Design a binder for these strands. Sequence first.
DNA 1: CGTACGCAGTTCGCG
DNA 2: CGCGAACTGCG
Length: 748
Amino acid sequence: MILDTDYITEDGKPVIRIFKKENGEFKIEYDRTFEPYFYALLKDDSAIEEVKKITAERHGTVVTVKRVEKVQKKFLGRPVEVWKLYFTHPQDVPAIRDRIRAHPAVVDIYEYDIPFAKRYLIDKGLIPMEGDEELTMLAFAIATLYHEGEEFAEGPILMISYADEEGARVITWKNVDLPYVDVVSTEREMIKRFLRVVKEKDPDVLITYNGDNFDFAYLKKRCEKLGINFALGRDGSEPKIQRMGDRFAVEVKGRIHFDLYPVIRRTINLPTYTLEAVYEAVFGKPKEKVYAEEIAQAWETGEGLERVARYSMEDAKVTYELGKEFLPMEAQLSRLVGHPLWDVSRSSTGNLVEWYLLRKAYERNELAPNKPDEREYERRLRESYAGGYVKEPEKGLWENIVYLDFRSLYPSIIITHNVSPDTLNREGCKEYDVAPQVGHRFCKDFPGFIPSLLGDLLEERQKIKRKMKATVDLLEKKLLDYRQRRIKILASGYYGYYGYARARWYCKECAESVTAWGRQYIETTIREIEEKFGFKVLYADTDGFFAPIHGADAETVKKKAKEFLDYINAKLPGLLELEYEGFYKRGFFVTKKKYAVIDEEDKITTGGLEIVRRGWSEIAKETQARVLEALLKDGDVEKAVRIVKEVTEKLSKYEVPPEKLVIHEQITRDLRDYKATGPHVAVAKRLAARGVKIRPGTVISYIVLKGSGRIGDRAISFDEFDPAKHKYDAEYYIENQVLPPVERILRA
DNA sequence: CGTACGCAGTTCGCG
DNA sequence: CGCGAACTGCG
Ligand SMILES: Nc1ncnc2c1ncn2[C@@H]1OC[C@H](OP(=O)(O)OP(=O)(O)OP(=O)(O)O)[C@H]1O
Ligand SMILES: [Mg+2]
């Protein structure tokens, strides 16, 4: 099995290192024959004598063109003649890249920014996470002493806990009488003992939770001050910290640092992403949280340290139990995309698409287009197109509604119609597929680049979905849904990649066509089911609709639904297939993207309502459900109002716990870039003002205290809330949190 | 580093 | 006030 891939320099030459695990033994394979390169297109081949002479300057020593090779490739399915410009060191490319392209006889250059380590995996056709090996895992967390206003890692690390298959332990430099706590003299020896523990166990994977932005950065600065060689890598190297825009990423050579934070973000939608909330959402078990203020009081006074030891212990145990479940999903994801687990688990949709396309483009001798410069990126940013069709819903209560949705509509349209930049308006074809509204033509004489790839991705999604119904244990089935939902978003991401401003294969006309076909296929199917089968589409969004048959019983509307499915599926071309997504007893439709339905088993399904939105407190989500049950299950509006008065009167009497009054909202940029300061911004700013780091993606959890004026003026972080000192705003959480979401529903 | 558009809903400043 | 803008998140 291939774990990762990097390169070192030996006498000026790059040496690709392949970290592998075969037959249960970690090994390092060396390749000193790979040479960096990038392509260049010229006007006349006579200029090749002048391009070889082009030199640049890299830290004193000169850099020259090592070797050249005229090769025959294809640029978007069309023949192209480029020259392979070879170089000694990979870092020689960024020094001479702009100057070779600057030659008057050079049209453009290509493939000059692919990292040399990833270039080795693509060119040699290596796929990581392949094989029968069972990796060894070990999670770890740290408990650090904090005081308001102190610099990062100014206070010392108090405890270092680790966990794996043999249990969990904590290392601290103060006496704690618990059987799983190893007592130690000083903090430096505590860090040293943990370093020896990782070395003795030699885990291939290191599980952390936000270790990319805290744990490894804290252990680093502490090791600098204490003079410790924190050699965690299998080559005796210290963990490297990398910058990724606004967040940091930490790599460990020879192993795989599996930070659980970015994985859970792209996998589960939660109002808060604390380790305690994530552990509860996945396993159904509650985790106690000890705050940075109590741990200080426990350390300076000495009493209560046993409680803090359990917190750090559980922090490592919870992280190992969480990492043991989500690694198999990312391992297969690393297999499909073709990049290491370390890079894939931290990447969004844009690179998960482009990396797989880069690997497949090399297989087909397809010269990859370049990422746009700053200007072309800004031009594609403002560029947009029409999206999906949303019908203004039919208001009122309705009976016996069925939900019909298209199966992978956007990927089906891409493959059925061969939507691809190497296909868009290709000259000389005998068969075309014209898109409605936009009018873009697409050749069909041969499978396009992207459509030939998107086929296998849908099969993988249907492979996990088929395993979901066959699995009975509630935990595995929950993880398989996360898996399929991860592949489903990845598949539709190939459409968004067409309109992605930083995409190499950016094809806006491809993106306009996909949504244009999507709008035509949903509006035609809606009309067909209304005039030909007697259905009545009450609401529709992009690729699905809810429609009953007036006066018909349940069994007939379900039988006629599957009947219409065979009719429209026999009329749809290619992979377009309408699916039966479920039957609903009674259903509500307030407005666009907001509805509430009940099923035959009395379960309440909602869409886009405040019950799901994060920026609504729990007392709002709790009350809305009670009004939703009385209306859809009990069918009685008067009790629904009676529930509201009881909750509203409860907030007035200061009777609801402050845990059910926390409003969460995510920071989406640097705090200085904000133009309008809301409540969650006013709290985020007051955290960076006193030392608390705030990066984009941070979820601000605040509570609104009693006062007058701006809501953000009296909003404080919930961790700062003490019920003896702060009294929450009874009127705000009434008039602004509970009534509006229910009053909008009670309009019916 | 950073998939797409559509659109309901809230906070805030202000005339 | 309540529109207009900024802002978020869901589907
Ligand atoms: N995050 C997204 N980014 C881009 N396009 C998307 C996204 N989500 C959905 N689409 C596309 O927008 C329309 C459609 O959304 P469904 O997710 O509701 O349906 P499937 O088609 O995914 O597959 P199933 O029905 O789950 O078997 C999808 O094609
Ligand atoms: Mg669908």
